[PDB]
PDB file of C-alpha atoms and ligand atoms in Angstrom:
ATOM      1  CA  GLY A   1      25.735-275.403  70.324  1.00 46.03           C
ATOM      2  CA  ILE A   2      29.504-275.762  70.576  1.00 50.43           C
ATOM      3  CA  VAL A   3      30.164-272.544  68.596  1.00 53.02           C
ATOM      4  CA  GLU A   4      27.984-270.433  70.980  1.00 53.59           C
ATOM      5  CA  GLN A   5      29.342-272.351  73.885  1.00 53.29           C
ATOM      6  CA  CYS A   6      33.044-272.545  73.078  1.00 54.20           C
ATOM      7  CA  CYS A   7      33.591-269.296  71.099  1.00 52.03           C
ATOM      8  CA  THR A   8      32.065-267.052  73.662  1.00 53.59           C
ATOM      9  CA  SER A   9      34.298-268.480  76.409  1.00 52.84           C
ATOM     10  CA  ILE A  10      37.101-271.114  76.105  1.00 56.13           C
ATOM     11  CA  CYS A  11      36.276-274.780  76.358  1.00 53.23           C
ATOM     12  CA  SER A  12      38.564-277.228  78.148  1.00 51.32           C
ATOM     13  CA  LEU A  13      39.469-280.524  76.476  1.00 49.81           C
ATOM     14  CA  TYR A  14      36.845-282.143  78.689  1.00 51.64           C
ATOM     15  CA  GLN A  15      34.161-279.621  77.555  1.00 53.56           C
ATOM     16  CA  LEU A  16      35.141-280.193  73.906  1.00 53.71           C
ATOM     17  CA  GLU A  17      34.792-283.957  74.434  1.00 51.03           C
ATOM     18  CA  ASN A  18      31.039-283.403  75.221  1.00 49.37           C
ATOM     19  CA  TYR A  19      30.557-282.887  71.514  1.00 49.41           C
ATOM     20  CA  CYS A  20      32.075-286.181  70.432  1.00 46.61           C
ATOM     21  CA  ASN A  21      30.004-289.182  69.419  1.00 46.66           C
TER      22      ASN A  21
ATOM     23  CA  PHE B   1      29.549-262.874  62.441  1.00 49.17           C
ATOM     24  CA  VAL B   2      33.023-263.650  61.303  1.00 48.88           C
ATOM     25  CA  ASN B   3      34.564-264.048  64.880  1.00 50.39           C
ATOM     26  CA  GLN B   4      32.409-267.078  65.457  1.00 50.98           C
ATOM     27  CA  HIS B   5      33.063-268.261  61.935  1.00 52.11           C
ATOM     28  CA  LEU B   6      36.824-268.204  62.350  1.00 52.57           C
ATOM     29  CA  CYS B   7      36.567-269.725  65.867  1.00 49.36           C
ATOM     30  CA  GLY B   8      34.281-272.524  64.485  1.00 50.72           C
ATOM     31  CA  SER B   9      37.034-273.632  62.057  1.00 50.74           C
ATOM     32  CA  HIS B  10      39.411-274.103  64.977  1.00 50.60           C
ATOM     33  CA  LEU B  11      36.638-275.901  66.990  1.00 53.92           C
ATOM     34  CA  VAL B  12      36.087-278.523  64.278  1.00 54.36           C
ATOM     35  CA  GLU B  13      39.836-279.131  64.099  1.00 52.55           C
ATOM     36  CA  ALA B  14      39.893-279.513  67.895  1.00 53.80           C
ATOM     37  CA  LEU B  15      36.956-281.990  67.796  1.00 53.94           C
ATOM     38  CA  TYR B  16      38.688-283.942  65.059  1.00 54.71           C
ATOM     39  CA  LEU B  17      41.643-284.530  67.291  1.00 54.02           C
ATOM     40  CA  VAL B  18      39.882-284.835  70.688  1.00 54.20           C
ATOM     41  CA  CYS B  19      37.230-287.264  69.522  1.00 53.67           C
ATOM     42  CA  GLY B  20      39.600-289.758  67.886  1.00 56.33           C
ATOM     43  CA  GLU B  21      38.017-292.763  66.250  1.00 55.61           C
ATOM     44  CA  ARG B  22      34.559-292.086  67.594  1.00 54.05           C
ATOM     45  CA  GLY B  23      34.358-288.851  65.622  1.00 51.26           C
ATOM     46  CA  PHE B  24      31.901-285.986  66.031  1.00 50.98           C
ATOM     47  CA  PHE B  25      29.191-284.479  63.770  1.00 50.98           C
ATOM     48  CA  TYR B  26      29.202-280.764  63.251  1.00 51.56           C
ATOM     49  CA  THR B  27      25.953-278.941  62.870  1.00 52.73           C
TER      50      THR B  27
ATOM     51  CA  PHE C   1      48.032-294.270  59.153  1.00 53.30           C
ATOM     52  CA  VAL C   2      49.149-290.668  59.653  1.00 54.88           C
ATOM     53  CA  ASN C   3      48.660-289.805  55.999  1.00 58.81           C
ATOM     54  CA  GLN C   4      44.920-290.526  56.365  1.00 59.96           C
ATOM     55  CA  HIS C   5      44.915-288.641  59.604  1.00 56.50           C
ATOM     56  CA  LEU C   6      46.382-285.479  58.007  1.00 56.66           C
ATOM     57  CA  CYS C   7      44.030-285.840  54.993  1.00 54.46           C
ATOM     58  CA  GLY C   8      41.037-286.028  57.375  1.00 52.40           C
ATOM     59  CA  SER C   9      42.147-282.845  59.170  1.00 52.82           C
ATOM     60  CA  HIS C  10      42.032-281.005  55.863  1.00 50.29           C
ATOM     61  CA  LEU C  11      38.753-282.620  54.843  1.00 51.02           C
ATOM     62  CA  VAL C  12      37.144-281.418  58.141  1.00 50.71           C
ATOM     63  CA  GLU C  13      38.357-277.898  57.407  1.00 49.04           C
ATOM     64  CA  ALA C  14      37.047-278.077  53.754  1.00 50.00           C
ATOM     65  CA  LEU C  15      33.677-279.471  54.793  1.00 52.58           C
ATOM     66  CA  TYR C  16      33.279-276.791  57.410  1.00 54.28           C
ATOM     67  CA  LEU C  17      33.672-274.210  54.662  1.00 56.75           C
ATOM     68  CA  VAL C  18      31.688-275.986  51.930  1.00 55.71           C
ATOM     69  CA  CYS C  19      28.777-277.155  54.029  1.00 53.41           C
ATOM     70  CA  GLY C  20      28.000-273.938  55.861  1.00 54.47           C
ATOM     71  CA  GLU C  21      24.903-273.933  58.021  1.00 56.14           C
ATOM     72  CA  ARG C  22      24.105-277.565  56.869  1.00 60.41           C
ATOM     73  CA  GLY C  23      26.972-279.005  58.842  1.00 59.39           C
ATOM     74  CA  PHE C  24      28.497-282.293  57.836  1.00 60.91           C
ATOM     75  CA  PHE C  25      29.242-285.924  58.475  1.00 62.99           C
ATOM     76  CA  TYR C  26      32.882-286.993  59.172  1.00 66.90           C
TER      77      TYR C  26
ATOM     78  CA  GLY D   1      34.174-293.669  52.031  1.00 68.56           C
ATOM     79  CA  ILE D   2      35.316-290.072  51.935  1.00 70.56           C
ATOM     80  CA  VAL D   3      38.867-291.339  52.490  1.00 71.91           C
ATOM     81  CA  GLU D   4      38.971-293.564  49.414  1.00 70.26           C
ATOM     82  CA  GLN D   5      37.170-290.839  47.440  1.00 67.95           C
ATOM     83  CA  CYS D   6      39.092-287.739  48.554  1.00 66.72           C
ATOM     84  CA  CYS D   7      42.393-288.870  50.124  1.00 68.30           C
ATOM     85  CA  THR D   8      43.588-290.884  47.128  1.00 64.90           C
ATOM     86  CA  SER D   9      42.622-288.195  44.586  1.00 65.12           C
ATOM     87  CA  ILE D  10      41.513-284.588  44.941  1.00 65.76           C
ATOM     88  CA  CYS D  11      37.828-283.966  45.502  1.00 66.28           C
ATOM     89  CA  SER D  12      36.242-280.872  43.921  1.00 68.97           C
ATOM     90  CA  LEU D  13      34.110-278.653  46.230  1.00 64.39           C
ATOM     91  CA  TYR D  14      31.125-280.156  44.343  1.00 61.58           C
ATOM     92  CA  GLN D  15      32.287-283.646  45.323  1.00 61.44           C
ATOM     93  CA  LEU D  16      32.810-282.563  48.913  1.00 62.60           C
ATOM     94  CA  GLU D  17      29.302-281.245  49.104  1.00 63.16           C
ATOM     95  CA  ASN D  18      28.093-284.865  48.885  1.00 62.64           C
ATOM     96  CA  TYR D  19      29.214-285.105  52.435  1.00 62.74           C
ATOM     97  CA  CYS D  20      27.182-282.239  53.871  1.00 64.91           C
ATOM     98  CA  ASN D  21      25.003-282.244  56.433  1.00 65.97           C
TER      99      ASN D  21
ATOM    100  CA  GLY E   1      60.906-286.973  69.563  1.00 63.91           C
ATOM    101  CA  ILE E   2      57.334-286.388  68.650  1.00 61.16           C
ATOM    102  CA  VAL E   3      57.872-286.265  64.863  1.00 58.84           C
ATOM    103  CA  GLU E   4      59.559-289.687  64.925  1.00 58.02           C
ATOM    104  CA  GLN E   5      56.875-291.270  67.161  1.00 59.98           C
ATOM    105  CA  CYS E   6      53.771-289.628  65.673  1.00 61.85           C
ATOM    106  CA  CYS E   7      54.379-289.178  61.904  1.00 61.38           C
ATOM    107  CA  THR E   8      53.821-292.746  60.746  1.00 58.16           C
ATOM    108  CA  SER E   9      51.424-294.147  63.298  1.00 60.14           C
ATOM    109  CA  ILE E  10      48.782-291.828  64.757  1.00 57.71           C
ATOM    110  CA  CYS E  11      49.403-290.590  68.285  1.00 59.57           C
ATOM    111  CA  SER E  12      46.403-290.456  70.468  1.00 61.08           C
ATOM    112  CA  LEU E  13      45.504-287.633  72.749  1.00 64.46           C
ATOM    113  CA  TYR E  14      47.160-289.367  75.614  1.00 64.35           C
ATOM    114  CA  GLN E  15      50.331-289.963  73.642  1.00 65.43           C
ATOM    115  CA  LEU E  16      50.452-286.305  72.539  1.00 66.15           C
ATOM    116  CA  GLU E  17      50.202-285.392  76.220  1.00 63.35           C
ATOM    117  CA  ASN E  18      53.679-286.857  76.794  1.00 64.61           C
ATOM    118  CA  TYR E  19      55.034-283.757  75.078  1.00 62.86           C
ATOM    119  CA  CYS E  20      53.459-281.196  77.355  1.00 62.45           C
ATOM    120  CA  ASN E  21      55.472-279.406  80.032  1.00 62.63           C
TER     121      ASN E  21
ATOM    122  CA  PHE F   1      61.382-283.942  53.796  1.00 64.84           C
ATOM    123  CA  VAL F   2      58.146-282.220  53.041  1.00 64.89           C
ATOM    124  CA  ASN F   3      55.922-284.843  54.712  1.00 63.21           C
ATOM    125  CA  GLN F   4      57.842-284.502  58.037  1.00 63.15           C
ATOM    126  CA  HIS F   5      57.536-280.769  57.840  1.00 62.79           C
ATOM    127  CA  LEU F   6      53.824-280.916  57.275  1.00 61.06           C
ATOM    128  CA  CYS F   7      53.268-283.592  59.967  1.00 61.14           C
ATOM    129  CA  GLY F   8      55.251-281.465  62.497  1.00 59.20           C
ATOM    130  CA  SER F   9      53.072-278.373  61.699  1.00 58.06           C
ATOM    131  CA  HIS F  10      50.002-280.423  62.645  1.00 55.27           C
ATOM    132  CA  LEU F  11      51.748-281.904  65.695  1.00 56.30           C
ATOM    133  CA  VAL F  12      52.627-278.492  67.197  1.00 57.91           C
ATOM    134  CA  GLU F  13      49.021-277.265  66.557  1.00 63.04           C
ATOM    135  CA  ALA F  14      47.776-280.414  68.339  1.00 62.43           C
ATOM    136  CA  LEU F  15      50.207-279.840  71.290  1.00 61.21           C
ATOM    137  CA  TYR F  16      49.062-276.243  71.602  1.00 57.35           C
ATOM    138  CA  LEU F  17      45.494-277.459  72.090  1.00 57.74           C
ATOM    139  CA  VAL F  18      46.200-280.538  74.229  1.00 56.21           C
ATOM    140  CA  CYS F  19      48.709-278.991  76.608  1.00 59.71           C
ATOM    141  CA  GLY F  20      46.652-276.011  77.734  1.00 64.17           C
ATOM    142  CA  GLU F  21      48.283-273.505  80.072  1.00 65.56           C
ATOM    143  CA  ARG F  22      51.289-275.883  80.679  1.00 66.19           C
ATOM    144  CA  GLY F  23      52.366-275.509  77.048  1.00 67.57           C
ATOM    145  CA  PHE F  24      54.723-277.899  75.362  1.00 67.53           C
ATOM    146  CA  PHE F  25      58.359-278.330  74.484  1.00 66.55           C
ATOM    147  CA  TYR F  26      59.736-278.672  70.945  1.00 67.00           C
ATOM    148  CA  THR F  27      63.355-279.030  69.874  1.00 68.98           C
ATOM    149  CA  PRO F  28      64.024-280.696  66.462  1.00 69.54           C
TER     150      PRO F  28
ATOM    151  CA  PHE G   1      40.247-265.522  76.603  1.00 68.83           C
ATOM    152  CA  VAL G   2      39.098-267.032  73.245  1.00 69.04           C
ATOM    153  CA  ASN G   3      40.860-264.349  71.189  1.00 68.95           C
ATOM    154  CA  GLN G   4      44.177-264.870  72.886  1.00 69.09           C
ATOM    155  CA  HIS G   5      43.658-268.647  72.385  1.00 71.89           C
ATOM    156  CA  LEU G   6      43.111-268.259  68.693  1.00 68.52           C
ATOM    157  CA  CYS G   7      46.010-265.856  68.325  1.00 67.07           C
ATOM    158  CA  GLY G   8      48.254-268.457  70.084  1.00 64.14           C
ATOM    159  CA  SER G   9      47.197-271.135  67.588  1.00 61.16           C
ATOM    160  CA  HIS G  10      48.395-268.921  64.739  1.00 63.85           C
ATOM    161  CA  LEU G  11      51.533-267.847  66.587  1.00 62.98           C
ATOM    162  CA  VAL G  12      52.535-271.536  67.030  1.00 63.09           C
ATOM    163  CA  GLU G  13      52.093-272.088  63.279  1.00 65.41           C
ATOM    164  CA  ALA G  14      54.166-268.971  62.505  1.00 64.50           C
ATOM    165  CA  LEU G  15      56.931-269.925  65.011  1.00 63.27           C
ATOM    166  CA  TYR G  16      57.087-273.435  63.534  1.00 61.08           C
ATOM    167  CA  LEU G  17      57.752-271.949  60.096  1.00 60.33           C
ATOM    168  CA  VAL G  18      60.225-269.221  61.049  1.00 59.26           C
ATOM    169  CA  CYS G  19      62.133-271.150  63.777  1.00 55.60           C
ATOM    170  CA  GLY G  20      62.781-274.218  61.500  1.00 55.81           C
ATOM    171  CA  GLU G  21      65.279-276.687  62.975  1.00 59.07           C
ATOM    172  CA  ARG G  22      65.703-274.532  66.086  1.00 61.90           C
ATOM    173  CA  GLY G  23      62.227-275.182  67.420  1.00 59.26           C
ATOM    174  CA  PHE G  24      60.621-273.011  70.119  1.00 60.07           C
ATOM    175  CA  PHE G  25      58.706-273.271  73.391  1.00 62.80           C
ATOM    176  CA  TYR G  26      55.138-271.863  73.384  1.00 60.10           C
ATOM    177  CA  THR G  27      54.128-271.381  77.062  1.00 59.88           C
TER     178      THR G  27
ATOM    179  CA  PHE H   1      47.745-289.052  45.676  1.00 62.11           C
ATOM    180  CA  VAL H   2      46.631-285.730  47.348  1.00 62.14           C
ATOM    181  CA  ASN H   3      50.022-284.853  48.858  1.00 65.39           C
ATOM    182  CA  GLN H   4      50.636-281.812  46.732  1.00 62.79           C
ATOM    183  CA  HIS H   5      47.074-280.668  47.363  1.00 65.84           C
ATOM    184  CA  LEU H   6      47.538-280.764  51.149  1.00 67.87           C
ATOM    185  CA  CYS H   7      51.000-279.231  50.886  1.00 67.28           C
ATOM    186  CA  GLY H   8      49.714-276.356  48.821  1.00 68.80           C
ATOM    187  CA  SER H   9      47.375-275.225  51.598  1.00 67.71           C
ATOM    188  CA  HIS H  10      50.344-274.939  53.934  1.00 66.50           C
ATOM    189  CA  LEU H  11      52.381-273.299  51.264  1.00 67.15           C
ATOM    190  CA  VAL H  12      49.897-270.373  50.696  1.00 68.35           C
ATOM    191  CA  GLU H  13      49.723-269.985  54.453  1.00 68.44           C
ATOM    192  CA  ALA H  14      53.541-269.727  54.575  1.00 69.34           C
ATOM    193  CA  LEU H  15      53.588-267.186  51.681  1.00 69.39           C
ATOM    194  CA  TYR H  16      50.956-265.136  53.482  1.00 69.32           C
ATOM    195  CA  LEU H  17      53.143-264.926  56.602  1.00 68.06           C
ATOM    196  CA  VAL H  18      56.448-264.487  54.803  1.00 67.60           C
ATOM    197  CA  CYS H  19      55.308-261.791  52.407  1.00 64.90           C
ATOM    198  CA  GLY H  20      53.570-259.411  54.747  1.00 66.04           C
ATOM    199  CA  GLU H  21      51.680-256.406  53.432  1.00 65.24           C
ATOM    200  CA  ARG H  22      52.839-256.658  49.884  1.00 62.48           C
ATOM    201  CA  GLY H  23      51.221-260.110  49.380  1.00 57.82           C
ATOM    202  CA  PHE H  24      52.236-262.900  47.052  1.00 56.23           C
ATOM    203  CA  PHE H  25      51.990-264.275  43.516  1.00 54.80           C
ATOM    204  CA  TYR H  26      49.884-267.321  43.269  1.00 52.73           C
ATOM    205  CA  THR H  27      49.019-268.512  39.756  1.00 55.37           C
ATOM    206  CA  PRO H  28      49.645-272.337  40.033  1.00 56.42           C
ATOM    207  CA  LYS H  29      49.525-273.009  36.214  1.00 57.33           C
TER     208      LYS H  29
ATOM    209  CA  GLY I   1      55.415-273.902  39.216  1.00 59.17           C
ATOM    210  CA  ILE I   2      55.116-273.001  42.876  1.00 61.14           C
ATOM    211  CA  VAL I   3      53.331-276.092  44.271  1.00 60.40           C
ATOM    212  CA  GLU I   4      55.647-278.372  42.206  1.00 58.44           C
ATOM    213  CA  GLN I   5      58.651-276.433  43.409  1.00 59.01           C
ATOM    214  CA  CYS I   6      57.847-276.069  47.143  1.00 59.45           C
ATOM    215  CA  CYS I   7      55.740-279.174  47.682  1.00 59.36           C
ATOM    216  CA  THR I   8      58.195-281.599  46.103  1.00 58.59           C
ATOM    217  CA  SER I   9      61.016-280.269  48.402  1.00 61.72           C
ATOM    218  CA  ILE I  10      60.750-277.797  51.223  1.00 63.65           C
ATOM    219  CA  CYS I  11      61.421-274.197  50.354  1.00 62.71           C
ATOM    220  CA  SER I  12      63.608-272.153  52.659  1.00 61.00           C
ATOM    221  CA  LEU I  13      62.344-268.711  53.798  1.00 58.63           C
ATOM    222  CA  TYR I  14      64.500-267.187  51.061  1.00 58.90           C
ATOM    223  CA  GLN I  15      63.023-269.443  48.422  1.00 65.00           C
ATOM    224  CA  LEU I  16      59.467-268.609  49.686  1.00 63.07           C
ATOM    225  CA  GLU I  17      60.361-264.922  49.426  1.00 63.58           C
ATOM    226  CA  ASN I  18      60.779-265.474  45.661  1.00 64.27           C
ATOM    227  CA  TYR I  19      57.012-265.491  45.478  1.00 62.30           C
ATOM    228  CA  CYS I  20      56.364-262.199  47.244  1.00 61.98           C
ATOM    229  CA  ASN I  21      55.075-259.238  45.252  1.00 61.59           C
TER     230      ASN I  21
ATOM    231  CA  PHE J   1      45.347-255.265  63.467  1.00 59.43           C
ATOM    232  CA  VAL J   2      45.790-258.912  64.441  1.00 57.59           C
ATOM    233  CA  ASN J   3      42.122-259.791  63.984  1.00 62.92           C
ATOM    234  CA  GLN J   4      42.413-258.782  60.301  1.00 64.95           C
ATOM    235  CA  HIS J   5      45.667-260.733  60.067  1.00 63.50           C
ATOM    236  CA  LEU J   6      44.119-263.892  61.429  1.00 61.28           C
ATOM    237  CA  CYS J   7      41.029-263.481  59.103  1.00 61.22           C
ATOM    238  CA  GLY J   8      43.548-263.168  56.199  1.00 60.96           C
ATOM    239  CA  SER J   9      45.112-266.539  57.135  1.00 63.12           C
ATOM    240  CA  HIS J  10      41.663-268.114  56.859  1.00 61.84           C
ATOM    241  CA  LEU J  11      40.710-266.309  53.674  1.00 58.31           C
ATOM    242  CA  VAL J  12      43.958-267.497  51.979  1.00 56.67           C
ATOM    243  CA  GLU J  13      43.214-271.108  53.010  1.00 58.72           C
ATOM    244  CA  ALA J  14      39.576-270.791  51.741  1.00 60.63           C
ATOM    245  CA  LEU J  15      40.641-269.137  48.435  1.00 61.27           C
ATOM    246  CA  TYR J  16      43.156-271.915  47.947  1.00 61.96           C
ATOM    247  CA  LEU J  17      40.299-274.469  47.961  1.00 60.67           C
ATOM    248  CA  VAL J  18      37.738-272.329  46.127  1.00 61.31           C
ATOM    249  CA  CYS J  19      39.982-270.989  43.351  1.00 57.49           C
ATOM    250  CA  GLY J  20      41.816-274.245  42.498  1.00 55.63           C
ATOM    251  CA  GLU J  21      44.136-274.068  39.534  1.00 56.21           C
ATOM    252  CA  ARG J  22      43.293-270.394  38.735  1.00 53.37           C
ATOM    253  CA  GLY J  23      44.864-269.145  41.975  1.00 52.76           C
ATOM    254  CA  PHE J  24      44.284-265.758  43.520  1.00 51.49           C
ATOM    255  CA  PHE J  25      46.168-262.724  44.819  1.00 49.64           C
ATOM    256  CA  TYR J  26      45.882-261.800  48.470  1.00 50.77           C
ATOM    257  CA  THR J  27      47.018-258.196  48.907  1.00 53.53           C
TER     258      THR J  27
ATOM    259  CA  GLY K   1      37.507-255.221  49.396  1.00 50.81           C
ATOM    260  CA  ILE K   2      37.764-258.743  50.721  1.00 50.93           C
ATOM    261  CA  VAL K   3      38.404-257.735  54.410  1.00 50.98           C
ATOM    262  CA  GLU K   4      35.334-255.475  54.676  1.00 47.96           C
ATOM    263  CA  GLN K   5      33.242-258.059  52.817  1.00 48.01           C
ATOM    264  CA  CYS K   6      34.464-261.259  54.463  1.00 53.55           C
ATOM    265  CA  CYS K   7      36.031-260.469  57.822  1.00 54.47           C
ATOM    266  CA  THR K   8      33.064-258.608  59.351  1.00 55.22           C
ATOM    267  CA  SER K   9      30.468-260.953  57.826  1.00 56.33           C
ATOM    268  CA  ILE K  10      30.781-264.479  56.551  1.00 56.72           C
ATOM    269  CA  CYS K  11      31.380-264.929  52.851  1.00 58.08           C
ATOM    270  CA  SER K  12      29.928-267.821  50.997  1.00 57.03           C
ATOM    271  CA  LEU K  13      31.991-269.990  48.572  1.00 59.16           C
ATOM    272  CA  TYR K  14      30.489-267.905  45.793  1.00 56.93           C
ATOM    273  CA  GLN K  15      31.415-264.605  47.327  1.00 59.09           C
ATOM    274  CA  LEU K  16      34.952-265.847  47.904  1.00 60.10           C
ATOM    275  CA  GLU K  17      35.116-266.990  44.284  1.00 57.56           C
ATOM    276  CA  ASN K  18      34.726-263.367  43.141  1.00 59.09           C
ATOM    277  CA  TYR K  19      38.285-262.892  44.346  1.00 53.98           C
ATOM    278  CA  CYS K  20      39.871-265.711  42.384  1.00 54.27           C
ATOM    279  CA  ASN K  21      42.109-264.984  39.362  1.00 53.86           C
TER     280      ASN K  21
ATOM    281  CA  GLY L   1      55.874-261.713  76.301  1.00 53.62           C
ATOM    282  CA  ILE L   2      54.761-262.884  72.884  1.00 56.55           C
ATOM    283  CA  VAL L   3      51.050-262.428  73.562  1.00 57.12           C
ATOM    284  CA  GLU L   4      51.544-258.881  74.686  1.00 57.42           C
ATOM    285  CA  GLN L   5      53.827-258.211  71.784  1.00 57.65           C
ATOM    286  CA  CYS L   6      51.962-260.057  68.993  1.00 59.22           C
ATOM    287  CA  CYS L   7      48.261-260.593  69.643  1.00 58.91           C
ATOM    288  CA  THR L   8      46.959-257.016  69.021  1.00 57.48           C
ATOM    289  CA  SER L   9      49.661-255.563  66.768  1.00 54.94           C
ATOM    290  CA  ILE L  10      51.018-257.822  64.049  1.00 53.86           C
ATOM    291  CA  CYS L  11      54.545-259.266  64.504  1.00 53.24           C
ATOM    292  CA  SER L  12      56.487-260.051  61.290  1.00 52.77           C
ATOM    293  CA  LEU L  13      58.297-263.412  60.956  1.00 51.37           C
ATOM    294  CA  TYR L  14      61.303-261.329  61.668  1.00 47.37           C
ATOM    295  CA  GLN L  15      60.080-260.108  65.141  1.00 48.63           C
ATOM    296  CA  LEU L  16      58.795-263.683  65.821  1.00 48.86           C
ATOM    297  CA  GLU L  17      62.339-265.136  65.402  1.00 45.57           C
ATOM    298  CA  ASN L  18      63.102-263.621  68.871  1.00 46.05           C
ATOM    299  CA  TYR L  19      61.039-266.368  70.311  1.00 47.14           C
ATOM    300  CA  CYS L  20      62.910-269.242  68.681  1.00 47.22           C
ATOM    301  CA  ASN L  21      65.150-271.547  70.697  1.00 49.43           C
TER     302      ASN L  21
HETATM  303 CL1   CL M   1      41.219-267.067  64.231  1.00 47.24          CL
HETATM  304 CL1   CL M   2      49.311-282.153  55.540  1.00 46.41          CL
HETATM  305 ZN1   ZN M   3      48.308-280.444  56.504  1.00 44.86          ZN
HETATM  306 ZN1   ZN M   4      42.228-268.721  63.159  1.00 44.48          ZN
END
C-alpha cells in the first residue's frame, strides 16, 4: 500500500491523491 | 519497523490535507 | 470551519496510533 | 459523527477505538 | 497573509498553493 | 493568540508538503 | 529522499516555534 | 471544547525541542 | 498547571524553559 | 542522531495521548 | 529504555503506557 | 544549508535561529 509505496521513495502530491476516495 | 511507522504518521496527515472533503481510508 | 479542520488533523494522528494494523475510518 | 463526539469534548483512546478499522 | 485568510475558513489545496514560491 | 499560533503551525506544515521543491514564503 | 523529507517537516515545525514573529523561508 | 487538549500536544512538542537532552517536567495535575 | 498556563496564552521560549529539567 | 530525535518527537506526542492526566517524563 | 524499545520496533499503546508517570 | 547542517546531527533551537528571517 501507500506506506510501502510512499515511505520507500517519496510520493508527489499527485501520487498521494491516488489514495483518496 | 519504526521508519515506516513514523513515515506512516506523516502520510496520513498528508492524505488528510490532499484529499479534502472526499477523505481517504487508511488500512 | 478551521477549528473542525484542526481537530480532524489531530484525530487522524490519534486514530493512526490507536488503530494500528486495523486502520480506520475518517 | 466523530466530530460531534470528539471535537466538542475529549475522547478517551477507548472511545477513539470505536472508529477503527 | 495566510494566517488571516486560512485560520477561520478552510483553505483548499489550491488556495494553499498561492503561498508557494 | 494561542489559536492563531496553532493554526499557523499547521499552515506551515501544509505549505511544506504542498509546495514541494519550490518551498514557500512566510513573514508574519 | 524520504528521510530528508521527513526531517524537513520537523525542521519547519522547529523554525516556526523558534523564529516567532520573524518567520522564515524553508526552501 | 477540546482546545486545551489540542494545544497540549503542541506544547509537549515545544518543550521537547526547547529543553534538549535534559528533558522536561510534565505532570499536568 | 502547564496546559492551563501555556494553552490559555502563548508561552515565550523563556516561559517554556521554566518547564525544563 | 537525528533519527532518534525525530522518533522522540513522535513518542512525546503518543505519550501525551496515552498517558493523559498522569503525564510522563521524556529524558 | 524507550528509544531501544520503541524507535527500532513499533510500540503498542500498552508498551508506551509503561512509560507514563 | 540547513539540511546539511541539521538532518544527521541535531541542531538546537539556538542553531536553528540562524535560519530565521
Ligand atoms: Cl519522522
Ligand atoms: Cl490545533
Ligand atoms: Zn494542532
Ligand atoms: Zn516525523
